[PDB]
Amino acid sequence: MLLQKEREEIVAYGKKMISSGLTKGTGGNISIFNREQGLVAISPSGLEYYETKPEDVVILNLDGEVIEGERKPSSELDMHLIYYRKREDINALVHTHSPYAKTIASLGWELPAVSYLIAFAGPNVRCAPYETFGTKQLADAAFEGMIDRRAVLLANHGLIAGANNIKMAFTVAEEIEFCAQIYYQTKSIGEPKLLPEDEMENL
Amino acid sequence: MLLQKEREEIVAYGKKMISSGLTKGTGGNISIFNREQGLVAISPSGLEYYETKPEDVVILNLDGEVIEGERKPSSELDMHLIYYRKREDINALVHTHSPYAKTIASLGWELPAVSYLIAFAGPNVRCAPYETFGTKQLADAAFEGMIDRRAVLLANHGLIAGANNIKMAFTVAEEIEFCAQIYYQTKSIGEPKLLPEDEMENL
Amino acid sequence: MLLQKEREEIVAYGKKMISSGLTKGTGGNISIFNREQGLVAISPSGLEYYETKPEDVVILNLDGEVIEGERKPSSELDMHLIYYRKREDINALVHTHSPYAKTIASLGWELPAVSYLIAFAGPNVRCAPYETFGTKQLADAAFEGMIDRRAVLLANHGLIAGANNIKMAFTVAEEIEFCAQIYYQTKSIGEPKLLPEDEMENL
Amino acid sequence: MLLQKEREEIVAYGKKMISSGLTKGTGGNISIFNREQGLVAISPSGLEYYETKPEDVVILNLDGEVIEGERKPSSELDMHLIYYRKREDINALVHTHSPYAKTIASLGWELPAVSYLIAFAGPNVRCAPYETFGTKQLADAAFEGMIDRRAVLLANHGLIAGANNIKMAFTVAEEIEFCAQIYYQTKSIGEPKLLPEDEMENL
Ligand SMILES: [Mn+2]
Ligand SMILES: [Mn+2]
Ligand SMILES: [Mn+2]
Ligand SMILES: [Mn+2]
């Protein structure tokens, strides 16, 4: 099989996603880019994470064509491909439907520097405006909201995080979900203290 | 045994319900309709989900008479039967006592389009007014609140979701509970952005 | 050993308590009364629930004297014994340090009829005023707050629930914790609808 | 190996930390001081807790020099060493990135006597002002905020707890996180009742 290592990683981290509470059901999706070949491994659409085998992962080229795999690729594949076409610093993406990030996103709010952990994404995390699930418009909105960042909130939908490898992409998704929990909880009872921009640069 | 497949599914999804945090104790209940025979399989009353065997599931006809099974059928069976009598698009029901749906229900509020996932149920989810547990009045209220929808909130009680099969009925219950969590959390700190009606139709 | 059945049940339900999120650490405690003998089995003080064996459970008489067992009985034993002396309808007690009940208790608030599940305890659940941990004063406060009820909130501390057997006592503790979660969450965003007194009698 | 017992305990309690929800990812860190030798065992930097073996734990002297171990010691090691240099009552430290403590910390608030469990730390828990992750400035801030206490909140970061042994240090971290949950939840809907200073002394 093509991209064997990547396929195994997508299976492993999909299990980690549902187990960490970062998604519900079969929703959410993960991809890993093999930069040497120009090929993308992506989670299959609508399969349970603990029922997914490496052979179920789908291999795409950057035009969205299936190169290998019998399963349907994630319905959100356009939102993954755009990062591998239009940046060179992202080789893996974790897209979650996680509750605290989705909460901040569904208010249309940015996530400010409520924690030093925000630095996993940047000085803040922007909120991309709503676009329809599974469309190129949403792919554009996600990418544009994530410029010079490693994560972006998706209004009324969730979060996507990217990094140089899958371990770091997952770390960014999990730590930014945690930051969103802190922002939601502090805003529930008061006004959080925020870190200054130069400290966020320092970090 | 009658409805063997359905019995096995009710056992499996009952375990999924308690494990997903969608109910407490022995509360909540699941049914599956065999349309070909006019028979309903339903979870037994007051049994622990991880102690339930396929033989413990009870088979009813549409008049509420026990056709097969030694256990007492769910005390909420009237609220299940009404859907199999008065609609033709529902073949399975998942009734939960889940916290975020019950929260919105106990305010007497509808659940509006805070997420694209609301479309699993419809353009919104209504709240049926309170009626006493285990009665035909509650069955009527649930059904009437769920007209042209796949889920309804039950004031001071919980949620019921229905669909063409048990996998989809469970999916609707879990995703609408998640939507209720987002609505509760956003309303705690601000005013959520809602999706327009034509987008909900689009979805 | 004396009260073998009761000892095994205390071990089993202690595990259920920590696993259900109804307590933290070694805190909380469970007792079961053998009415025929006038003997009380109670969880040992400061032992981890998954490290507790039936022989670790302590047997007391109604004067608080150790009849059998090498372990120290729960430091909260006075709050258990009073129910077995001064009522005849309670044969088991589950005392939790659970977050939503403790939240309502730490405001000094009663828990009103926000759910039909409140009927597991009565028409409402009172809040006993604060008294020092491990004292007879707290035992008196708990008992007095629980008159004609199967549960009571303990200000800045937790909850105790009692019933005719251990399965029902645990059920009351878990369902009243759930009701407290609904009350906390509804009060966070609005004013919950409450069930009328005659309906609570009906239930 | 040096400090074998301590190494095994750090592995065990690191697993307990992630499993109790007291940290995310590889963040957080635990140390145990061998007072007889003047040596500190500390969790390694960036290793998954369930992938950590006793040999992965790092042994330091009080000058921060590695005495034994091939792994990099925790990046937060300065915040541990200061307690073993400047107090004599602390022999173990549990540093968490737990959500409710971090919430109160990120508002810059003290945690007052909302529960008798606050007495595990003292009459209250102070909030140390923000200092950069992994620095001696943060070590100083933590220590100074924890004077005459067994825990301190770290603004926009988390919590550290210390005690005479690792079991008690973990207990303090877990129970103070729980107290922070109660404070956050009560403040969300009202004004909590607080215990008086003389009662906190009594406790
Ligand atoms: Mn998505
Ligand atoms: Mn029900
Ligand atoms: Mn207690
Ligand atoms: Mn830290």
Numbering used by the authors:
A (entry chain A), B (entry chain A), C (entry chain A), D (entry chain A): 1 to 203
Copy the relevant paper text.
Our two structures of DrdA, bound and unbound with substrate, along with previous data on class II aldolases, allow a detailed mechanistic proposal. A structural homology search showed most significant homology to fuculose 1-phosphate aldolase, solved from various organisms, with homology to the E. coli enzyme the strongest. Structures of fuculose-1-phosphate aldolase (FucA) determined from several sources including S. pneumoniae and E. coli exhibit a fold common to the class II aldolase family composed of a five-stranded antiparallel β-sheet core surrounded by eight α-helices of varying length. The metal coordination around Mn2+ is close to ideal tetrahedral in the apo-structure and is a distorted trigonal bipyramid in the complexed structure. Without a supplement, zinc is the predominant metal found in the enzyme, however with an excess of metals included, manganese is incorporated at a higher percentage. These results are consistent with manganese being the preferred cofactor when low abundancy is excluded. The addition of Mn2+ to demetallated DrdA resulted in higher aldolase activity than addition of Co2+, Mg2+, Ni2+, or Zn2+; the apparent Kmetal value for Mn2+ was 0.95 ± 0.31 µM (mean and s.d. of three determinations).
